[PDB]
Design a binder for this molecule. Sequence first.
Ligand SMILES: O=C(Nc1ccc(Cl)cn1)C(=O)N1CCCC1
Length: 330
Amino acid sequence: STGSATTTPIDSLDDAYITPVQIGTPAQTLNLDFDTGSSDLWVFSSETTASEVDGQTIYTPSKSTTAKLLSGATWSISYGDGSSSSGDVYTDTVSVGGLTVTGQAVESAKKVSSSFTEDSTIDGLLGLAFSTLNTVSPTQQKTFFDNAKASLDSPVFTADLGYHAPGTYNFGFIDTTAYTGSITYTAVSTKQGFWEWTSTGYAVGSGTFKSTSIDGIADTGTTLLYLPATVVSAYWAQVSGAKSSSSVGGYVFPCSATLPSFTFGVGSARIVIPGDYIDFGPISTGSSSCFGGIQSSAGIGINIFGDVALKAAFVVFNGATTPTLGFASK
Ligand SMILES: O=C(Nc1ccc(Cl)cn1)C(=O)N1CCCC1
């Protein structure tokens, strides 16, 4: 089997991407944030505290003839941005782009933090990291991809995120028309439960390439590119008027400035992030200060190749016995 679904930016800045997912019988379609940095499929639901729901579409398990309570199961998760959610668990039928998993753990939110409430466009998350990170207790549950894997034509999924435009998640096949050149594959460590890999270096604009190992994670659920402070300083030093603002919480720049591209290495191959991808607009309405899309990972404890980086590439998440990551230009 295979599946193929369109993923759409939630706003004009590509702050996140939502993908429609069918849950239950008859189908309840929710727009979920596909997150290769986590491993829980959780949804706004009829069980979510009423005051914490504000425009989201909810899953109502009592209206699904295939829903079954996973008795005694609870879940609770926190994300890198300080957001969180928790609740209980049902198993149900879940379909993505024509690909169906029966008995998928669907984690129903009883509580969500304010950032989730305040984002009306995201109805939940669909985690695509390794199932070892899944938070369900007492019995850890498998991700949608892990459940589908054995049925798939090939044990892979791909992320093809758009810049200010829709893109595609495919399951079970590699669309050879979706990228240019070749796909370069690179080793993955699953020891932290992430799609963790090592970039071979970087360049800023037309500058020479710096060969240096940068260990990080391929994370579709993180908006920006977070790299070591040295690398980030070297980037913004090439932007007239750019500065790191502690009050804003990162690098900002006057949008009268022209942003250079940023290149990162995948083995001997190179992915070029165009400068425009690094502009996240005014820090507040009407401000002449813009927020940068490349920021320091210092104090995160890990480098994160988030959407800013991934949307410059066609990315293969290869779930073979020894997982690997593939990157192509597009
Ligand atoms: O928290 C996240 N990323 C993130 C955000 C900020 C920083 Cl410094 C680091 N990481 C994240 O992956 N998600 C997915 C759902 C909404 C939040």
